[PDB]
Design a protein around this ligand. Structure first.
Ligand SMILES: Cc1cc2nc3c(=O)[nH]c(=O)nc-3n(C[C@H](O)[C@H](O)[C@H](O)COP(=O)(O)OP(=O)(O)OC[C@H]3O[C@@H](n4cnc5c(N)ncnc54)[C@H](O)[C@@H]3O)c2cc1C
Ligand SMILES: Cc1cc2nc3c(=O)[nH]c(=O)nc-3n(C[C@H](O)[C@H](O)[C@H](O)COP(=O)(O)OP(=O)(O)OC[C@H]3O[C@@H](n4cnc5c(N)ncnc54)[C@H](O)[C@@H]3O)c2cc1C
Ligand SMILES: c1ccc([C@H]2CCCN2)cc1
Ligand SMILES: c1ccc([C@H]2CCCN2)cc1
Lengths: 340, 342
């Protein structure tokens, strides 16, 4: 049984590993390969701020709430292990800041120690009048990618750096199942006009004194179009733009300014932070994650495609529940093929 | 008038600045000088883990509670300012871990968001069954010392390398008031057998991924004789020994081991941390802080000494309240001499 996962971003590798760990022991042969035209550090996952937190508003599909939860508990269960940091994983506490009262988020009980900020805490943030405190996890994408590829490699999964032109060519090259984990570029293999790039720019900074995440919201502005500060493993991420529809891969001057001034005002000590790097990523924005299976027909073998894309600005946050779901759909595929 | 502060640790410089800021404008001339035989980075303050947290048990003098509180609110009021990190100041959250239930600490309301740990949080710390979460402040001693000396220097206060042999010599050199901020060595200038060194050893480490403080307690072995982990401004402090009565200034292997294994078991990711330095400090341990006024006589001139030493393992935590108290006593000294504040 030959499985090609297309994509080496967080979604690809997580899904690839989950499939292998679930079925290596029961299927023989099972051959899993990863194709992609960029690997770390060249994916959007690499640019990700690296924090577990869903959108403040609930999701359309309630399965996603669950996929987030599964992802959190998965990640939390690693805290305590010697290799947590090598995976890019470590606990962080921080603040969500609003200019007025808002409902509690659907994920309040999933995180650790959710509570509302007290009048004292707020004086720390002059420009805001309401907010939350909680404890969550950093998942640094660059590092987690390095961990997964190593974990994949150790188990004999093989990587191929290449550009897939169609699902057809890959099936024709001998894939029985295709897991489509192509992020914002899924539309090149099958038009999907619900999928748009969520263009976010970030500034990477050396400011090791900052131990807490700080995320502001501007309800009249759209999610992550207000300043945010997220301590990483060895640097800090500064953001404040997330504009959907823009396909520009290059850094922009106006965005640099919006992020720097917004964050400098939020966290004035930034005046002495050294700028280390500036990047631009595309979140695969979609009303809903596409995680379903599809039957494609070329030549003689019917080939099965399982999509797993459109995780917007929360791919790190939801990834494991999504992989888990794909490996189950895959199980069904094995079934119908009397393969167990 | 002429004021000599003896000591350039956190207590000396704090007290010096507070006195200057309160009385520069009302006394003329006011001449404040600092004498010490070590400055940053060679004081015990420099070796301090750098975290705001009093002892878990209540203090003998309840005033120290207030002094801790004042210190916290003072420091908190700077969060939001551009210069917070330059002062060595930044917020941190973390965990206090116990093997069994304990009373809430007297300072629970002073910190931010004190609460008890939940069963899930405890899963992160296999060896422990009860604890707290809260948010507090880092005050890195090395950095704060640098800030204070700069702030002192800008206001014309002058620093002198000098080992003081007696209070007499300094008075005879023309000091009207002496502020005694000599830490654990105060006994050299006036015996005080209540003062003992609290020898603590620490390992400084590069483990930037660790954002939270983690302090374990062993109620039977005494305070800070159980592993503790404190993220600093650009490195992490690892500890687990605090033995009173030992005057050994050299690092020892047994303590290095107690700290490394204890902390590696607490925080297993430390396996990849690079060791960047190892130190040994002496906390000026005392049943309580000596902060009182004393009149000394040498040849019919009255010299006024105000002591401010014996802050044990909490000098950073309590310093500002203690400085504030010294300024008050100094104000009283002025009153008695018919001099007028405000
Ligand atoms: C600035 C920014 C900050 C973010 N911060 C966070 C955060 O803090 N927390 C969080 O949870 N999420 C965050 N996100 C969202 C998260 O980064 C994304 O949802 C996630 O990285 C998308 O992962 P992916 O694997 O689906 O796509 P990608 O990471 O882009 O990977 C896609 C892969 O598909 C491959 N590919 C595509 N088409 C082809 C083809 N035809 N042939 C071969 N290979 C192909 C690419 O080479 C690539 O390897 C952020 C996003 C941005 C832009
Ligand atoms: C390992 C360790 C970790 C600690 N961690 C923390 C923590 O996280 N938080 C906290 O609040 N506290 C902590 N402490 C306690 C804290 O370090 C002390 O309470 C504080 O540093 C004492 O400050 P000080 O200025 O009185 O003494 P010091 O910092 O020792 O300064 C003493 C000064 O007096 C001078 N001096 C003495 N005698 C003479 C003389 N005859 N002539 C001239 N100069 C003289 C010295 O040269 C020096 O300048 C820790 C202590 C240790 C050992
Ligand atoms: C753009 C910018 C930042 C993000 C992060 C912030 C915290 C979780 N998602 C997503 C998208
Ligand atoms: C010895 C060792 C450590 C300490 C610190 C740990 C946190 C606050 N006091 C004091 C004394």
């Amino acid at each position: 049984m030959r499985v090609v996962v297309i994509g080496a971003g967080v979604i690809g590798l997580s899904t690839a590993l989950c499939i292998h760990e679930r079925y290596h022991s029961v299927l023989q042969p099972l051959d899993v390969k990863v194709y992609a035209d960029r690997f770390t550090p060249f994916t959007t996952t690499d640019v990700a701020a690296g924090l577990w937190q869903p959108y403040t508003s609930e999701p359309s599909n309630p399965q996603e709430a669950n996929w987030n939860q599964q992802t959190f508990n998965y990640l939390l269960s690693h805290i305590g292990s010697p290799n947590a940091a090598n995976m890019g994983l470590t606990p962080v506490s921080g603040y969500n800041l609003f200019r007025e009262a808002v409902p509690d988020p659907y994920w309040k009980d999933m995180v650790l120690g959710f509570r509302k900020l007290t009048p004292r805490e707020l004086d720390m943030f002059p420009d805001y009048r309401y907010g939350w405190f909680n404890t969550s996890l950093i998942l640094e994408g660059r590092k987690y990618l390095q961990w997964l590829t190593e974990r994949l490699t150790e188990r004999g999964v093989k990587f191929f750096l290449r550009k897939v032109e169609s699902f057809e060519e890959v099936a024709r090259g001998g894939a029985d199942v295709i897991i489509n984990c192509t992020g914002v570029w899924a539309g090149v293999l099958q038009p999907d006009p619900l999928l748009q790039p969520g263009r976010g720019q970030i500034i990477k900074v050396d400011a090791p004194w900052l131990k807490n995440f700080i995320i502001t919201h501007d309800l009249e502005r759209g999610i992550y179009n207000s300043p945010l500060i997220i301590p990483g493993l060895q640097a800090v991420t500064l953001g404040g733009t997330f504009q959907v529809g823009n396909w520009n891969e290059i850094n922009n001057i106006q965005d640099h300014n919006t992020i720097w001034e917004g964050c400098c005002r939020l966290e004035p000590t930034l005046k002495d932070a050294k700028i280390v790097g500036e990047y631009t990523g595309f979140g695969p924005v979609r009303p809903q994650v596409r995680l379903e299976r599809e039957q494609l027909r070329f030549g003689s073998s019917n080939t099965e495609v399982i999509h797993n894309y459109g995780h917007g600005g929360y791919g790190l946050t939801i990834h494991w529940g999504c992989a888990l779901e794909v490996a189950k759909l895959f199980g069904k595929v094995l079934e119908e093929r009397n393969l167990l």
